Each structure stands twice: as C-alpha cells, then as structure tokens.
C-alpha cells in the first residue's frame, strides 16, 4: 500500500555526451543514456531525473541560475526541465541533430550548434505560467560550410566563438549592432578546429585543432588585424585531441586525447601542469569547475567518469559503470549496500546512500549468474558459468574460499544456508544440486531427483528448508538438515522459471511459463493461491518482428520474482518492458511500471545475426528497508522508492482530527494526543513537528502509553529519520524508551516489527557505533599520553 517512484540509476555514471558542472560547483550533471544523472559531490549523494527522451541523449547544459536545464536527444527533440523542482517544462523539436548546446553567460539566450548552422534562441522565463509556444528565435547564423564542432560564449554575452569542420574558427556578435565588432574568420589550422576560447580580458583568442596545434590570436598592426603571434603544438606521437575546455579565470587548458590521456596546461606560456592517463579509450568529454579547481573527464567506451581536484591532485569522484548488462542483484541484509553482477564476470559493491561503487571483484572468468548474502551479511556468495562458486568477505573485501564441481559444471543459480554453513548451486546441464560446506570447502553431497534442469534455489530463513524448481514441471522441498533426508515433490502446470520464498518460510511462490505465479504451502505441500500474469505483461514488437505483438509469445512470463518483506506483495519482471507489483492475498495488480521508453531499444514500442539490444529485467528484489525495490536491466540498476511520500493516506481519522488541532494539543502539552493524532493524519512534517517537540522528561511517559497499533509505524518512522538525522542521542532515548516499554510485545510478534527493528539496528550499527569507536579510542589515547612516562 505504497506508491513507488523512480529515484536513481546505479551501475552507470557516464555513457556519452557532454558533462556540465553546476554553477555552485557542488553538483555534476552527467548524461546517462536516455536519462540524466545528478551527483552531489559535496553531499556524496546522487539522483537521476525521472523524465526520459525518445532516443539516446546527445547534449546538455545548466544555466548559471541553476533553474533551467535543457536536454536534447540525437533526433534534436529537446526537453526543458526545472532543475530545482525536477519537473519537465516544455518539449520542443528542433528537427535537426544538435551537436552542442550552451546557455549565454547572461542566461537570456542559449546557442545551438545545428549542422553547419548556429541557432540562437531566447530563454523562457520559469517565473511565468506555462506558455504553449515559449521559444522565439533571436537570429540564424550561416557562415560555416560543414558541421560545427562546438561553440563558446563571450563572458559579457555579446560574442560567440564557433569551431567547425572548416579547419577554421569563426566569431559572431550576439547584438546586430555589434556585427562589425566581430565578423572575422580565423584560419591556419591544418586539421579540424574543435574549440575556440577567449582570454579573461577577451583580447586574445585561443584556437585548438585536432592535430594538436594551439594558435593564439591578437589584434595588432602589420591597419590592425588578427594574427597568430604564438603557436603551440601537442607532440603526441599518434594521440589525437578529442575534447578541449578552457578556464579564463585561471588560464587552465584541459585537453583530452583519443589515446586516453589528458594534459593540463597554463596559457599562454604552455606550461605542462600535469599529464595522466585514464586508460586506452578516448576521453570523450571534459569540463571545468566554476572555481577551476575540479576537472571532470568522461570516456564513453567503458562509461568512465572521474572528478579530479588537480590543485590537490585528489579524486573527488571516481566511478566506472558495468560494460555489460547487470545479470543479478542482491541487497545487504541491512540494505546499506547492494551488489551488482554483470555478464562481463566482474562484481561491484555499491552504497545505496552514496550511490557509488566501493569495490569491484574480477576473479570470475566468465559471466556471473547469481549473487546472494548470508543472514549475517558479513559474507557474500556468487556463481558463474566459469564453473566456480566464490565466497567473499565484505568487511575485508577478499575471496577467502572458492568452490567448484568435479567436472566444471556451469552454474546458474545459488542459495545459502541462513546459518552460513552450506552453499548449494544449480546448473542447466546436470539436473543435480551440488552442496558445499562453507567452513571446509568440500562437496558434502549432490542432491538428485530432478527430471529437469534446476532453475532456482532458496533456503528458508527460519525453518531452513530448501525449495528447488526446474523446467521439470515440478517443485521439490529438501530437508537436508537432520539425521534423515526427505524430499517432497509438488507438480506444477508448466515449466518453473523463478521462485520466491516467504520470509516466514511457510509459503513459496513460483513463476511459470504459462504466466502464472502460484503460491504453495510448504508444510502442507498444497497450492494456496494463484495469480494470472499473461495479460498484464507488456511486450513490444521488435523491429525485426514479422508477426504481431498481440500474437507474440516471445515473453509473456516472468523470469524473476520476489516477495515483499511484509509478505503481502510480489515484485516480478521478465524479458519485457514491464515490472508488475502484485498483492498476494487479494491476487490483484497494485501497479505496473514501464522499464524504458527508448525507441533505440528493440522491445520498448545467412550467417549474420540480426541482433540488437533488447529491453529486459534480469532480476528484482525488495529493499530490506521496505521503502524501495531495485530492478536490474540492460541500462543498469533502476531503483524505485516511496521516499517522496507526497500522498495523503490518513489512518483512522475523524472530523476532530486536524493539523491545527494537533498543534493546539502541543501548546496545551498533551503530547500523547498530539503524537497519536499526527499518525492518524500520517503527514511526515506534522509527525516530525510532534516528534521533536516532546521534552526528554516526558519521553518515557508517552512511549509507555502509545497504542499498540501505532507502535510499528513510529518504530519505522524513527529508523528512517534517525539514519540521516543529526539528533543522534535524542533518537537513542526514543528507541530506548520504546524498546524498554514495548519490548515484550515485539517479541510476541517478531514478523510484524521485523522491518522496523531492522531499520533501527541499521542506524545503531552503521552510524551510532562508529561514533563511540571514535569516542572511545581517543579516551584511551588520552590515558596513554598522560599516564606513561615521556620520552628521554
């Protein structure tokens, strides 16, 4: 009973196009395929814009005011979005491939590099109400005979430098009256001119060519005319200059070569400040901070993004996205971190809060198929088609043990004992479930009984039963633990592709090829419910299809499913464009999600394979925080969350209940009524107001007298609030008061508070414990320096 909304995309930080720093310099705008990602360097936080283009993005920029952002795709269709409010404002089609877009340093105009043509457009005013036709053109300039590489604005917003494939640099004047001031074409370069820049005084003009030549232009006598007084050359043996940017205030020249190395220079002296390599692939884009202290670089081939504090030679941001599609995903038990698995065979560990890769593991030779955590969360396990299962410690980030079959069996699925002492994997070629001992690394035994290939596995978190399904049209429950081994097979209507396990461990859900999610009772081995999926799924006819989508049967099943930790919902996905969220007890569709809207992707709408990327969801799971769920897809790890909570969902409300009345109760000091009233409205800001207004002396009183029905809600509220709040010890009193007063009740109903308790424990372990460690070590550091004898 919550509305999920797309929040951010992990696994990809740069794909192509130009990256622009925010005017404040604290945020970086990076294009990511069909969407735009925003990274807060100072706060170490990121988000991705919800709006989407028809095709892959081409060019972007942000105005100095930080309010208007324009995004243009490869077809020239532009989207104007309010940066502050994160909402689309206008859609305009420029009807031509726009190579580059840059706002004026006044902000009133923005220039568009369109073919061999320069377009200038007036900026709509965000303050005004929604206009139907806000774009009106100032002027059209047509001087170049081939495509324009890039353009640069004059600091006074009066002139524009444009560099094109003419081997020439041409200047313009924004004002018609000032045409005589700047109507000159610069020539001399022997290769394509990429970027022309002004000095801070604007007296000099610097031009750069692909061959690696920098020409400095001055207005001087021979009656006055432009001339190349000084010439500087980049002596790259074969590397060609790929992207160039300039910072007039600090006279910094940042150049990116196709060989994958960038050089920092000081003009006009041409002093090589530094020279580093990002790799062997071209540096596609380069940007400079408003101070000029941070440089951002981007390589498209590997999706490499880096922000360099060249002053201190430190790395503000340093991230590389998966080259392949993410085949699988797994959350940490606490939900702090998520691990993503790709067809390359490299694993990456990601932090949800920061949205950044802490480490990558490249021990697996082939594609990694599945990843899961133990109940403790200290260890993580992964399986790959290379024929190995590898156990990873995440506290120390090392592969402490590896498992493998006798004859190098390709594995596709894995499951781990909650006790963290047994690991089982399945294969598509043997029909046997191998079993390994985590402690020893020996093959305990091979479970046999499948008449088909094992498609999925899962150990019950509580009871420790193992449920395995196959294309065998049957499901088998294995009681491996204990003196005697028992197997209980259950038949299913069709082949089983995915399986989910209720956290209570009393039920198991399985997705079949027929498009059915069937729920069974493990103890009774009898079906308890079923859900239809065939009609809900949305599948788009591929461009190579010669038969209709409605008749198509390529994918109307779910290849992956997962429960909600509350246990009332299941999230499902498949090789389709749809993610469907269901309600198990009622067997109805809660809401459907469109994975992608990129027309380039195949499914959104004799020796050669007619083969292009397809939209698909490899894996899906709920966050243990019970506030978000992430879906692995070709574009990357999508995350949908309910954090906004802008919906009004009152609970047990009455006419007497009102925000003003709640405030009056606070003023009359009726904290319990004010606190209880707040949840009945279920407005976060009111609950925050009541939560922080309660005096510490009265916390034990209100906590004791809270009704039982509101206890799970308040417990959840504190957990999510405390993780990012500053009032550490205030929350600790609140948690202490609730647990001491209502501890016995939580024991009697563990599952009801399971998610709420976990969020509390996450706050206590991840941040609160870290503070005391920094507190206690200094306490002992104090005692040594004072107690023991000083040096001679």
């Amino acid at each position: 009973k919550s509305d999920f909304k797309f929040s951010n995309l992990l696994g990809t930080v740069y794909r192509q196009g130009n990256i622009t720093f925010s005017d404040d310099g604290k945020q970086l705008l990076s294009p990511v395929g069909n969407r735009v990602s925003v990274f807060d360097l100072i706060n170490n936080k990121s988000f991705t814009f919800e709006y989407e283009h028809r095709k892959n993005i081409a060019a972007i920029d942000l105005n100095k005011q930080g309010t208007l952002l324009i995004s243009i795709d490869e077809d020239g269709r532009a989207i104007l979005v309010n940066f502050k409010a994160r909402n689309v404002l206008h859609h305009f089609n420029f009807k031509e491939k726009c190579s580059a877009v840059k706002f004026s340093p006044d902000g009133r105009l923005f220039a568009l590099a369109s073919g061999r043509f320069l377009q200038i457009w007036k900026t709509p005013d965000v303050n005004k109400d929604r206009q139907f036709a806000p774009f009106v053109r100032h002027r059209v300039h047509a001087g170049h005979f081939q495509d324009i590489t890039s353009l640069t604005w004059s600091q006074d917003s009066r002139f524009i430098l444009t560099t094109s494939k003419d081997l020439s640099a041409k200047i313009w004047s924004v004002d018609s009256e000032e045409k005589n001031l700047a109507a000159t074409t610069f020539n001399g370069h022997r290769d394509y001119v990429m970027g022309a820049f002004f000095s801070h005084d604007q007296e000099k003009i610097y031009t750069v060519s692909k061959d690696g030549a920098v020409f400095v232009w001055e207005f001087t006598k021979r009656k006055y005319s432009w001339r190349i007084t000084k010439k500087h050359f980049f002596y790259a043996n074969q590397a060609k200059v790929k992207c160039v940017t300039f910072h007039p205030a600090t006279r910094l020249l940042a150049v990116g070569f196709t060989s994958g190395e960038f050089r920092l220079y000081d003009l006009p002296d041409f002093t090589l400040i530094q020279q580093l390599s990002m790799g062997q692939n071209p540096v596609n884009t380069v940007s400079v901070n408003q101070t000029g202290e941070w440089l951002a670089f981007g390589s498209s081939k590997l999706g490499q993004l880096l922000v360099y504090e060249w002053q201190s030679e430190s790395y503000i941001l340093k991230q590389q996205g998966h080259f392949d599609s993410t085949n699988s995903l797994a959350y940490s038990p606490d939900g702090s971190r998520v691990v993503t698995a790709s067809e390359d065979g490299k694993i990456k560990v990601w932090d949800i809060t920061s949205g950044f890769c802490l480490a990558t593991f490249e021990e697996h030779t082939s594609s990694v198929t599945a990843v899961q955590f133990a109940k403790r969360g200290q260890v993580m396990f992964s399986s790959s088609l290379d024929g190995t299962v590898r156990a990873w410690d995440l506290i120390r980030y090392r592969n402490f043990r590896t498992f493998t079959g006798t004859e190098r069996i390709q594995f596709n699925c894995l499951a781990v004992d909650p006790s963290g002492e047994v690991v089982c994997a399945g294969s598509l070629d043997n029909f046997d479930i191998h079993v390994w001992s985590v402690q020893t690394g020996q093959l305990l035994d091979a479970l046999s009984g499948h008449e088909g290939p094992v498609s999925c596995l899962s150990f019950s978190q509580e009871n420790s039963v193992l449920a395995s399904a196959s294309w065998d049209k049957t499901i088998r429950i294995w009681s491996i633990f204990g003196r005697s081994q028992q197997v209980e097979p259950i038949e299913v209507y069709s082949d089983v592709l995915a399986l989910s396990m209720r956290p209570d461990g009393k039920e198991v859900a399985v997705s079949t090829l027929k498009g059915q999610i069937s729920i069974f009772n493990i103890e009774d081995a009898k079906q308890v419910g079923n859900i239809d999926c065939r009609k809900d799924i949305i599948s788009g006819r591929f461009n190579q299809d010669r038969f209709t989508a409605k008749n198509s049967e390529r994918s109307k099943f779910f290849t992956t499913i997962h429960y909600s930790f509350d246990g009332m919902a299941i999230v499902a996905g498949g090789n389709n464009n749809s993610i469907c969220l269901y309600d198990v007890p009622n067997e109805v569709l809660l809401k459907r999600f469109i994975v992608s809207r990129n027309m380039a992707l195949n499914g959104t709408l004799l020796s050669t394979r007619k083969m292009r990327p397809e939209v698909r969801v490899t894996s899906v799971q709920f966050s243990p925080t019970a506030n978000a769920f992430a879906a692995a897809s070709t574009e990357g790890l999508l995350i949908y969350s309910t954090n906004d909570t802008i919906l009004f969902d009152p609970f047990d409300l009455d006419v007497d209940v009102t925000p003003h009345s709640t405030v009056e109760a606070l003023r009359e000091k009726q904290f319990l009524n004010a606190l209880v009233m707040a949840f009945r409205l279920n407005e976060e800001y009111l609950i925050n107001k009541v939560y922080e207004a309660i005096p510490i002396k009265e916390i034990p009183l209100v906590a004791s007298n809270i009704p039982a029905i509101y206890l799970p809600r308040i417990l959840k509220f504190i957990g999510d609030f405390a993780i990012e709040s500053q009032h550490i010890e205030f929350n600790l009193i609140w948690i202490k008061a609730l647990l001491s007063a209502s501890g016995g009740y939580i024991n009697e109903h563990k599952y009801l508070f399971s998610t709420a308790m976990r969020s509390i424990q996450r706050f206590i372990v991840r941040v609160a414990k870290e503070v005391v460690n920094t507190t206690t070590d200094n306490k002992y550091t104090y005692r040594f320096l004072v107690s023991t004898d000083g040096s001679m």
């Binding site: 600091q155 006074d156 604007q202 207005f219």
Partner: peptide, 7 residues
C-alpha cells in the same frame, strides 16, 4: 585593443 574586448 581587440574589438572583442570587454566593455
């Protein structure tokens, strides 16, 4: 001074 100079 250049025609493109500030002011």
């Amino acid at each position: 001074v250049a025609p493109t100079a500030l002011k």
